[PDB]
Amino acid sequence: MKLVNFLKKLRNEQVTIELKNGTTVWGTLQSVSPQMNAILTDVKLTLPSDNIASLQYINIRGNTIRQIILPDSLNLDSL
Amino acid sequence: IQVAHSSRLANLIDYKLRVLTQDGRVYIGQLMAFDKHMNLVLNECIEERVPKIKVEKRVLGLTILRGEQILSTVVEDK
Amino acid sequence: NGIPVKLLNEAQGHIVSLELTTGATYRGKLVESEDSMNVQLRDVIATEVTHMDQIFVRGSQIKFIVVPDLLKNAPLFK
Amino acid sequence: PVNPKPFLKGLVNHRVGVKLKFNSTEYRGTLVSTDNYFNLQLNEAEEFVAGVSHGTLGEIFIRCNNVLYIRE
Amino acid sequence: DEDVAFEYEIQKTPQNILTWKRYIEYWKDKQIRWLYERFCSQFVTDTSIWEDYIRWESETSRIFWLFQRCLKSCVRDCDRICLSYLELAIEMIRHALASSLMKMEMHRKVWDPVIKFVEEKV
Amino acid sequence: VSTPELKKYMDKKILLNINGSRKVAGILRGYDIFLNVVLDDAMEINNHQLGLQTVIRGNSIISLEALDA
Amino acid sequence: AELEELEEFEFKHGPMSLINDAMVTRTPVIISLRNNHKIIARVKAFDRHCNMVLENVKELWTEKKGKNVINRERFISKLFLRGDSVIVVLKTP
Amino acid sequence: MKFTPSIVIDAPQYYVDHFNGKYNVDKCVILRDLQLETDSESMPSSLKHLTHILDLTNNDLIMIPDLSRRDDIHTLLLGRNNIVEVDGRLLPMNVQNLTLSNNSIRRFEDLQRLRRAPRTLKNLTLIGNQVCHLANYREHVLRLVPHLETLDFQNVTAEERKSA
Amino acid sequence: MVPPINCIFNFLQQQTPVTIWLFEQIGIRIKGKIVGFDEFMNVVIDEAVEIPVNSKGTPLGKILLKGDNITLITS
Amino acid sequence: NTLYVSQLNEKINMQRLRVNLFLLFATFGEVLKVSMNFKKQRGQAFITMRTIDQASLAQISLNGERFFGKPLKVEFSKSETKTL
RNA sequence: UUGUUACGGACGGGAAGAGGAGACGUCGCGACCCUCGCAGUCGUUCUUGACUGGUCGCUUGAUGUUUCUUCUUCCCGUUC
DSSP, X not given: OOSHHHHHHOOSOEEOOXXXXXXXXXXXXXXXXXXXXXXXXXXXXXXXXXXXOOOSOEEEOTTTOOOOOOSOSOOOOOO | OOOOOOOSTTTTOSOEEEEEBTTOOEEEEEBOOOOTTOOOBBSSOOOBOOOOOOOOOXXXXXXXXXXXXXXXXXXXXX | OOHHHHHHHHOOSSEEEEXXXXXXXXXXXXXXXXXXXOEEEEEEEEEOOEEOSEEEEOSTTEEEEEOOSSSSSTTTOO | OOOHHHHHHHTTXXXXXXXXXXXXXXXXXXXXXXXXXXXXXXEEEEEEXXXXXXXXXXXXXXXXXXXXXXXX | OHHXXXXXXXXXXXXXXXXXXXXXXXXXXXXXXXXXXXXXXXXXXXXXXXXXXXXXXXXXXXXXHHHHHHHSSOOSSHHHHHHHHHHHHTOXXXXXXXXHHHHOOOOXXXXXXXXXXXXXXX | OOOOOOSTTTTOEEEEEBTTTBOXXXXXXXXXXXXXXXXXXXXEOOOEEOOSOEEEXXXXXXXXXXXXX | OHHHHTTSTHHHHSTTHHHHHHHHSOOEEEEEOSSSEEEEXXXXXXXXXXXXXXXXXXXXXXXXXXXXXXXXXXXXOSOOBOTTTOOEEEBOO | OOOOHHHHHXXXXXXXXXXXXXXXXXXXXXXXXXXXXXXXXXXXXXXSOOOOOOOOOSXXXXXXXXXXXXXXXXXXXXXXXXXXXXXXXXXXXSOOSOBOTTOOOOOSGGGGTTSSHHHHOSOOOOOSSGGXXXXXXXXXXXXXXXXXXXXXXXXXXXXXXXXO | OOOHHHHHHHXXXXXXXXXXXXXXXXXXXXXXXXXOOOSSSOEEEEEEEEEEOOOOOBOOOSEEEOTTSOOEEEO | OOEEEOSOOSSSXXXXXXXXXXXXXXXXXXXXXXXXXXXXXXXOEEEOBSOHHHHHHHHHHTTTEEETTEEEXXXXXXXXXXXX
């Protein structure tokens, strides 16, 4: 039905996401929710070219994440 | 910065977290409670401004934060 | 149900400061609290400065709501 | 008498004009179909950026949240 | 080099053996493997440390060597290591099943899988 | 679902402050759960009148000071 | 079951029909965004709320201060573009 | 013993200093009476965890060593130490509240690392040492370290500044 | 008391003059007559004319304004 | 445990004063009290410590110590603190 | 109970000379002030309910909105 389901199935894989501020932030997905509440273990940040100002841990809210990348190059959803 | 491999929001209750807002003002505070929208009740709020270079400081609130304008919370120190 | 909401409800008749999207910082008494975070105040100051008699605030556009240090542990949690 | 959804329905297979708030651009084309959440689908779409056209797109789709209004 | 620092700090004190884990998970990797092997050789001959060494080992020859290592000095978690070696050799299942009976001789359901394999083989 | 307590503000003049720097004012007639405030006055800001009664959407009503306490 | 199941065919009749078609027969589409953006890619997956997945994603935007137009470019592939940002999508021949 | 990583790991980083910031670390079994004779080595084990308030008092630290970012050790307490000289380029902006009481700072020239403070050290206090007893010491400090607001609990006044 | 659900009905009945306000631009404000009935705030309005009001005639037909984009209604 | 100070500079601010106190008392032992409870100023401050020994030491050493011009009069508290 | 899934040239700072400034608030360095103490004020009754660092300089303290329109000389650090 939904494609949040797809996200849910992914586990332990690096993915960049561009936020409303505008930073390319590669991190591990961890326990993904139905509300898209992501959590990243290792990450690279640019506080407002991408300047390096990185922190290790972070807890993401789902409303901010517009795009996601590099889980794994494969398309499977229905089960 | 020390922080263990936590799974979910329930396991990381009662910790000093940074919080980021939509306009770009940085916060800090100990996470007291939980909710559906992640309306995280901060134990003591020290708000910070950055003009559109250098970070400023305030000390007014010990707040109940609302979940609409939050970007992403970050753990500071246990 | 939401714990923050409960907390808010509990803190009825207390000096609670506020902040909106625009950043107008208020400080006055709390009249009433609901499921949706709708706050009304009495003898409310306004430092955006003015002194207002009463005000009602919409819940969606609030950035954060301030609470004092008294209701921290008891009697809301367990 | 004339409600919105029925008006919309009527306006199918006919010219429609729509504008946006963010990046004010007038889209002009013939309407195809609509749903309960008021999303749009046009044919022979012309992207008029404040009068002047960018390019003739053709068969296009538009989301509800951005749309300002529907006109002739 | 931090390897000499880790070795000197681990040698000056037996200090709740996770210092060897600090020597391990820093590089984790072959240096971590040799350091964890020297750690399991020196003081700690437990089942969890040997299992962590086998996890560092984890292609069938290395698994069989780790199973022969975990066969030596294993008393408490003997039947679980027996079933693990049975699953490892299931991919010499009979010889390692007799070795499982030797290490742990309680063993009815684990011997029932070998009997089910012997039934499916015919 | 839960009704906002606007029965206290009935028959009292209100100086509103909606989104986008606009100070509207008018007396309260009717209310609802969505906060679509049905008020019977509208004078914009200096001062000039533009129509009598005005029904406003719930999303675009942020601050509303009561004139009479 | 039926309340959600009847909504499955609602894509192919209404305004999502075109996008469904595109998904079925992979072809390039022009995707716009909020803060001055132009993305070009081919469709692969689809859901209810326009949270699409694509391939061969070419991006075109501007990060130029002082009114100078600069068209930067970089290859992206197999994304997950959320529906709140997507405004206009269209099947090109 | 010597300040290692293991010791740091062991250290009680539970009770936060509630005056400012969080995580008031006390290295080894207890930083108060740890007896770190050498310089503060293995600072990377902390990894800028936290004002931080790394209370490394009652030690035998010869020289003050830092290794962290601009917000990592503001309220550092190095009381009752044997601090000879504290020159360094790591802790530039962070260390404002420097509790260096009962130190072994002999000469005024020993404070030349802190001196030329416009860029060298963004903030620094220093007090309760052998150099405080020297003639025209406060004045000298004022001259060199302009960033020193509170000089041994009493503030650096305008008049004082003028004098120096 | 006048609830907003019955308000719509009343509007439909009467067909009064209206001056709708927008979110983005403060100056440009629509003027017409509301007709339709709907559960949401989305309502159809005939004879739409967009006037630039001070802090003068945009061509437009019988408008249907989006439910999230109405800032004011009058009668 | 607690040590009631007296005869100090009232002209200095509250938070700053507290900070200063903290700085002072970190050499003896772990200072438990983060902020002052009285909020009256002019000497009256209760330095709460973890250990009694530390407190004792502080009392011994900092009796009439120069802090912001005036000599601080150290003394043991009558009643025990709320935190302790 | 817990989890998951599905529904020499550059740069910076400070000072001087020649052709950044005004509002609104929000926290600080001094004090001629206030105030006087170990866990504040008042109502009512023999023990309980309510309400909570201020003011003045800065003799060039910090900081976010909101309108308008740089060169020369010396001193100190970094880089080649």
